[PDB]
Amino acid sequence: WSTASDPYSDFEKVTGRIDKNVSPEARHPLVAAYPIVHVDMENIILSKNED
Amino acid sequence: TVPDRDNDGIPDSLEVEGYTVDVKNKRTFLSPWISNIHEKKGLTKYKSSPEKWSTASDPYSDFEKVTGRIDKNVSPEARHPLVAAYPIVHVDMENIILSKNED
Amino acid sequence: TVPDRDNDGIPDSLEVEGYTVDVKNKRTFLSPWISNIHEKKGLTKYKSSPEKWSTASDPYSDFEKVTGRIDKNVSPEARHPLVAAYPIVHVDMENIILSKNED
Amino acid sequence: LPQIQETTARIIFNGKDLNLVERRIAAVNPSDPLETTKPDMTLKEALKIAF
Amino acid sequence: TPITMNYNQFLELEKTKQLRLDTDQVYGNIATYNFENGRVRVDTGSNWSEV
Amino acid sequence: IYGKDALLHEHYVYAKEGYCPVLVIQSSEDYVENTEKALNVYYEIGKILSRDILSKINQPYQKFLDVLNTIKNASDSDGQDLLFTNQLKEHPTDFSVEFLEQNSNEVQEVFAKAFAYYIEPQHRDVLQLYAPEAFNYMDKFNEQ
Ligand SMILES: [Ca+2]
Ligand SMILES: [Ca+2]
Ligand SMILES: [Ca+2]
Ligand SMILES: [Ca+2]
Give the strand pairing for B30-32 and B19-21: antiparallel
In three-state form (DSSP H/G/I as H, E/B as E, the rest C), the secondary structure along chain F is CCCCCCCCCCCCCCCCCCCCCCCCCCCCCCCCCCHHHHHHHHHHHHCCCCCCCCCCCCCCCCCCCHHHHHHCCCCCCCCCCCCCCCCCCCCCCCCCCCCCCCCHHHHHHHHHHHHHHCCHHHHHHHHHHCHHHHHHHHHHHHHC
E3 touches chain A (CB under 8 A): no
Distance CA F32, CA D11 (A): 37
Helix F120-129 vs helix F104-117: angle between axes, to the nearest 10 degrees? 110
Would you call F6 an interface residue with chain E, using a CB distance cutoff of 8 Å? no
A41 in contact with chain E, both atoms CB, cutoff 8 A: no
- List residues of chain C with CB under 8 Å from any CB of chain D: 16, 47-52, 55-58, 77, 80, 82-84, 86, 88
| Burial status of residue A16 (CB atoms within 10 A of its CB: 0-12, 13-18, 19 or more) | exposed
- CB B94, CB B66: distance < 8 Å: no
Strand pairing of B30-32 and E29-32? unpaired
* Chain C partners (3+ C-beta pairs within 8 A): B, D, E, F
Nearest to D33 among B23, B72, B73 (CB): B23
Tell me the structure's resolution in angstroms, rounded to a single decimal: 3.3
Distance A18 CA to ligand 3 centre (A): 40
| Contact flag B26-C5 (C-beta cutoff 8 Å) | no
Q: Which of F20, A32, E33 is nearest to B68 (CA)?
A: E33
How far apart, in Å, are the Cα atoms of F4 and each of B33, B80, D4, E35? Answer: 20, 21, 26, 9
The reply to whether E6 touches chain A by the CB within 8 Å rule is yes
| Cβ atoms of residues B6 and B54 within 8 Å | no
Q: How close is the Cα of E22 to the center of ligand 4, in Å? A: 47
Interface probe for D, chosen from B72, B73, B80 (most Cβ of D below 10 Å), is B72
Whether there are 3 or more C-beta pairs closer than 8 Å between A and C is no
Please indicate whether chains A and F are in contact, defined as at least 3 beta carbon pairs under 8 Å: no
Question: How would you classify the pairing of strands D21-26 and E41-47?
Answer: unpaired
| Count of positions (residues) in chain A | 51
F4: nearest CB among B9, B31, B37: B9
| CB-CB neighbors (< 8 A) of F125 in chain C | 30-32
Chains B and D touch, contact meaning at least 3 pairs of CB atoms under 8 angstroms apart: yes
Other beta carbons within 10 angstroms of residue B12's beta carbon come to: 17
Strand intervals (E) in chain C: 19-23, 28-32
- CA dihedral over F74, F78, F79, F80, signed as positive or negative: positive
Spatial separation of the C-alpha atoms in residues C79 and C70, rounded to whole Å: 9
Measure the CA dihedral F126/F132/F134/F138, to 10°: 100
Which chain C residue's Cα is nearest to B103? Answer: C102
C22 phi/psi in degrees, rounded to 5: -140, 135
Which of F:4-23 have CB within 8 Å of B?
4-5, 8, 10-11, 14, 17, 21
Q: Which residues of B lie inside 8 Å of D (Cβ-Cβ)? A: 21, 23, 26-28, 66-69, 71-73, 76, 79
Q: After which residues does chain E break, using C–N > 2.5 Å?
A: none
